[PDB]
Scaffold this active site. Structure first.
Site, PDB file in Angstrom:
ATOM      1  N   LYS B  44     -19.944  52.741  -3.697  1.00  0.00           N
ATOM      2  CA  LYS B  44     -21.416  52.881  -3.840  1.00  0.00           C
ATOM      3  C   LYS B  44     -22.137  52.222  -2.660  1.00  0.00           C
ATOM      4  CE  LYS B  44     -21.551  55.338  -7.588  1.00  0.00           C
ATOM      5  NZ  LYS B  44     -20.319  54.973  -8.291  1.00  0.00           N
ATOM      6  N   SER B 267     -11.179  53.016 -12.926  1.00  0.00           N
ATOM      7  CA  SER B 267     -11.357  54.398 -12.405  1.00  0.00           C
ATOM      8  C   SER B 267     -10.337  54.674 -11.288  1.00  0.00           C
ATOM      9  CB  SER B 267     -12.775  54.673 -11.975  1.00  0.00           C
ATOM     10  OG  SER B 267     -13.089  53.974 -10.788  1.00  0.00           O
TER      11      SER B 267
END
Lengths: 309, 309
Positions: B44, B267
């Site tokens: 991110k 993830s």
């Protein structure tokens, strides 16, 4: 293709970054060496690699035969744990109980075995326990981070050369918080070989300023102020020792996050505070001061939040 | 000299690493793209930079004039917060209360203002609150991570080219957990332009397999399984969607730490589990499978330890 063989080939070659908004009044430029960019977020990834690698190269340890042992409550345990995981060594970390549960969870994630010791006995208790486990465990090996020449050697071979190349040979001063003293000794020795006019500034807590002739004492600056002179520290290479308070270190770390977007450990705050002070001295006008930032600040914020709660 | 101007010049150019000990039975090679090496330890950081940078370049925001707003309970808030800190923007993050106290402490360290919303209303409640603050705040700007073309654009410009160059043009498959879908869309589009035979594998939770025609549901895989098709996801670029359970994702993340010395988010476990399955298919013998590992695992271990305690 430049795909790394394994995580050991991802260590070092960390960036330098200018400090831009915390340097009001500075007549010298300040750049930070970001050891927060190491795979496990601290400088100790370098010596975790070098101390295990050196033992292997000397035929002292074998994966799946040798048990590695280190007494460590800090990042040295994490640096050893991810290398031990990758290379397939059993690792035992000895530390006082009631130390950061967060650090313990990371060690366990890498499959390190934890031996917790009497908090009342502190680090000395953990060192004694490590020696006792070594004595009773065949083919066991203690890394000995404060005495192991592989500690300063990796900083002579990587950290120093990276700072020299990254600064285009323009570095005038290295500012380094002293834990083992491996960073300032190894990187400092290399830098003084390239330019003998380079000045090396050790940083220690006000509360445990043993290099300045003060008594050993408790302090909040994780990673520095060991309260003794490590075997691997060459005090003769140091040109000055700067004392920084835990309060000033915490305030500087807070400003680095708010103003630079650099989330760093309290010891990075200490190194930054010292570098900014040096860079304000008028006799340093036009110079480049490089501060080592040993670790990312998430570990500390997590540790504080648990210690508080 | 290669000293970075500021932390924005430290984003991207993350390494690829081979997986060596979790790939028993694989006939294809598996490499991981390590977004854990980003300055704030997740992918991110790329879209925090690109979404703010794009708005500036379009003259939509000004430092010290504009208020940035995003509804986010995950890494997007942290990516925006360190860029907002560096560039000097006021940032408001809206998220449900009772979300990770650890993530909130990091946001506050970067000087982000937090607006906590009714847990009962979930992410929808945070989105509504962000729109209400925008309406009442002049010169305010919502980044809109699920709709903002700057999200996939940065992956087309950096992530994809890095994987192509790093793999020496040998990548046959990209395996990507879908949150916004910016990574698989942007990097995937670039890769298919270099070699149209490259196959793109989306990864979603078994518990919220909406791309597979399943219902939206709760799941433990932070960062993926949004429960809707994001505006920035190009479903037509996907060649297959792999479902991985939270249990299998957690077990794979545990093995990556124990066997590879890679401490990664759940993830990353999901992406690794999917890539290992693909690499065991005999029709993939001799191929190179690249899995994106979106984040470092310390944030998760910290989050779990707080959620447990």
């Amino acid at each position: 293709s430049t795909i790394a063989k394994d995580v050991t080939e991802l260590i070092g070659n960390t960036p330098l970054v200018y400090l831009n908004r915390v340097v009001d009044g500075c007549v010298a430029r300040v750049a930070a060496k970001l050891e927060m960019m190491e795979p496990c977020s601290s400088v100790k990834d370098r010596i975790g690699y070098s101390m295990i690698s050196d033992a292997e190269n000397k035929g002292l340890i074998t994966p799946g035969e040798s048990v590695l042992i280190e007494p460590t409550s800090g990042n040295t345990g994490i640096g050893l744990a991810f290398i031990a995981a990758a290379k397939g060594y059993r690792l035992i970390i000895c530390m006082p109980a009631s130390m950061s549960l967060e650090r313990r969870t990371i060690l366990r994630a890498f499959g390190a075995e934890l031996v917790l010791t009497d908090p009342a006995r502190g680090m000395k208790g953990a060192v004694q326990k490590a020696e006792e486990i070594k004595a009773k465990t065949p083919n066991s090996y203690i890394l000995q981070q404060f005495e192991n020449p592989a500690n300063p050697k990796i900083h002579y071979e990587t950290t120093g050369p990276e700072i020299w190349r990254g600064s285009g040979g323009k570095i005038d001063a290295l500012v380094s918080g002293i834990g083992t003293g491996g960073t300032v000794t190894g990187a400092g020795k290399y830098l003084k070989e390239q330019n003998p006019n380079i000045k090396l500034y050790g940083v220690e807590p006000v509360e445990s300023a043993i290099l300045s002739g003060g008594k050993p004492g408790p302090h909040k600056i994780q990673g520095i102020g060991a309260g003794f002179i490590p075997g691997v520290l060459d005090v003769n290479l140091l040109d000055e020792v700067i004392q920084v308070s835990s309060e000033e270190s915490i305030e500087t770390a807070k400003l680095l996050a708010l103003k630079e977007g650099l989330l760093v450990g309290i010891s990075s705050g200490a190194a930054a505070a010292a570098a900014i002070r040096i860079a304000k001295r008028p006799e340093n006008a036009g110079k480049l001061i490089v501060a080592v930032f040993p670790s990312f600040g998430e570990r500390y914020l997590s540790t504080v939040l648990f210690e508080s709660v």
